[PDB]
Write a protein that binds this ligand. Structure first.
Ligand SMILES: [Ca+2]
Ligand SMILES: [Ca+2]
Lengths: 376, 5, 389, 5
């Protein structure tokens, strides 16, 4: 094994950025005390920074000069705090017994370690199920994640369902108040792959947001979901909960449809809803060529603003949650929006946008944000 | 508020 | 004036900035509902926005075209939230009965009002005692406030003492662990007339940062008798505010400033500040960082084996024999950030006595061995150390 | 911590 323990040299910002990412979600005082720590391992290929909680894994590879092979387990949060605050110079790390000597410029640290024999072996990644550009994975997750439930006291809403059939990937999440679904195409190895899993929203959202550099993001299914690429790699334990069968909820037709400018509507909602009781609801009176947004009671004040809008169908008065509604409009990432309506008590179907008097079909899109209204 | 399901 | 209540028109940015101004001095988070609101009165060529808290009153006057006189009391935070989110166009306000009609662009608001009968008559500003540039007042208060006590049980330390002699103003605050003194020259309306008051630090600190712009900020204390009783007005740049002074007697602080130093050290402040809170990462409970002064070097150290140990050496221009002294890292960087200079000068005596942090320019100063006198500066941050392990 | 007064 050898007398000289792990000894290496690397840039600090390269060191710091990799440790900050792996260390971010580590537990502060876990029942198993090693998980609090971060494990460094040098080899010919460079230095690897590892993190684990028995549920979620993080592993970052950085180029480094390895003077001697070895591994060491040191406190996670502190070491990301150290290298973030060190001067911009090379970092020398030398493991001395149960301690680690870290020197950068004129700064020197000796930090205690934990037994490297007590660190769990990280899960191995399943075989690669396919890969997609990091920019698309970032956008796809951002759209659907906003609709997942934010409260673990009802977990079944806290996940993002990932359905993979061949080259088509479908992502869905819902809190029972709103459903977001985006379809995309990716490069799958191999064709005829079909699997569906449900992943905790917040972590899968973090892996996507942290992945805009972007290189190419690889997803591995085998249960756990690996997300690899751009020198970083992570496995996430799936969720047991049953996701609703969600395509029965999407309407095929609408009694009325309306297309608007989203930036203009988002600003209107935010200002009108200032007097809305509890941010509960905003009213929208759809007539032809106009929508009148209104909220509030004699309680606080009342507000109303009229917007221009291409409308088809008979006039409809419907009220939505202003927060849920602006969440959807922000998810389209398009200049305009298309509202599928039926009744004031049924779901409204929002769609990104760049007939006669009869029932209007729902036009196919890659993204859909379906929102439930409020009483009146 | 209303529910999808 | 008559049947049509207060109705006026003014631009949004100006309306919003004044309401945002009064409402920020209106935390007023709970009941009573009289204290939650903001009161608008149009007259002459302009509009007045008024508010009150405990110990501080805010009034902002802006120009507006008053088509009809009147006053109205509407909710403070909400109307500041509305006027900031409206489109950038003129704002029309028309009081109709118990409600106020607000029209900007295509957005319209009808908000309830409260009886103007219930709004307190807020204190008069005393006569102007003088004025100083807001950018100097902003920095002068920012330096002295950081050393003021945040406590309650000890009212004496929670204020900023204002000593006024002629054109020279001296500002001081202390929590008993640290003393900050700034001396400046201002344009006085009574030179020479003497006075000393003590104003609550937190309010006087927030009013200063608010004020930055800007015009010259005017302080109103007395004519004087003589100072005066019982209030400090802060006016200028369209805003005016009163704060009730504190009765407590500020310590006599110039006895505490050392006349001599047995050893002195001058360093770069930016390089020392980063060194302190890098080393202090392992300092237990943020307690203390240790400095071993030898010549041409100081060694910062902290931490325990249970979490970690840290060491860093920096270059110092040192005079006198070696001294090892430890400070509170937070109190220490608080002083260094307050000097607002490229370099710092540390007056030392013993590891148990006060260290005097003095601002020094980029490059000016000259000092062989013997006792070094304390050089005069406009600012002083005096910090006392922590007992060594 | 040490005190000024
Ligand atoms: Ca990634
Ligand atoms: Ca539905």
């Amino acid at each position: 094994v050898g007398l000289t323990d792990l000894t290496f040299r690397l840039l600090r910002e390269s060191f710091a950025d990799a440790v900050s990412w792996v260390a971010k979600n580590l537990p502060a005082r876990p029942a198993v005390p090693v998980l609090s720590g971060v494990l460094l391992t040098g080899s010919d290929n460079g230095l690897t920074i590892s993190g684990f909680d028995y549920e979620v894994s993080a592993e970052a590879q950085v180029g480094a000069e390895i003077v001697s092979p070895g591994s060491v387990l040191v406190s996670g949060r502190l070491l990301s705090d150290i290298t973030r605050a060190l001067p911009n110079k090379p970092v020398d790390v030398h493991v001395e017994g149960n301690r680690v000597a870290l020197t950068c410029g004129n700064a020197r640290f000796s930090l205690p370690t934990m037994p490297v024999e007590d660190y769990p072996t990280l899960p191995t990644l399943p075989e690669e199920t396919g890969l997609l550009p990091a920019e698309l994975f970032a956008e796809a997750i951002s759209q659907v994640a906003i609709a997942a439930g934010r409260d673990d006291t009802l977990p079944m809403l806290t996940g993002i369902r990932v359905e993979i059939l061949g080259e088509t990937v479908v992502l869905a999440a819902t809190d029972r108040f709103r459903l977001a679904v985006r379809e995309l195409k990716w490069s799958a190895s191999s064709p005829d792959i079909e699997a569906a899993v449900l992943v905790p929203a917040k972590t899968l959202a973090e892996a996507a947001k942290a992945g805009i550099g972007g290189s190419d993001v690889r997803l591995s299914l085998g249960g756990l979901l690996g997300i690899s690429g751009n020198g970083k790699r992570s496995t996430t334990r799936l969720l047991d909960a049953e996701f609703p069968k969600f395509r029965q909820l999407l309407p095929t037709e609408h009694t009325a449809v309306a297309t608007m400018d989203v930036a203009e509507l988002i600003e209107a909602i935010k200002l009108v809803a200032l007097v809305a009781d509890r941010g509960a609801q905003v009213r929208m009176e759809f007539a032809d060529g106009s929508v009148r947004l209104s909220a509030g009671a004699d309680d606080v004040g009342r507000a109303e603003e009229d917007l221009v809008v291409d409308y088809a169908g008979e006039p409809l008065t419907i009220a939505f949650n202003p927060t849920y509604l602006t969440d959807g409009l922000s998810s389209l990432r398009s200049e305009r929006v298309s509202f599928g309506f039926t009744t004031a008590g049924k779901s409204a179907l929002l769609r990104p946008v760049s007939n006669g008097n009869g029932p209007f079909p729902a036009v196919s899109t890659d993204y859909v944000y379906l929102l439930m209204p409020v009483r009146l | 508020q209303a529910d999808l399901f």
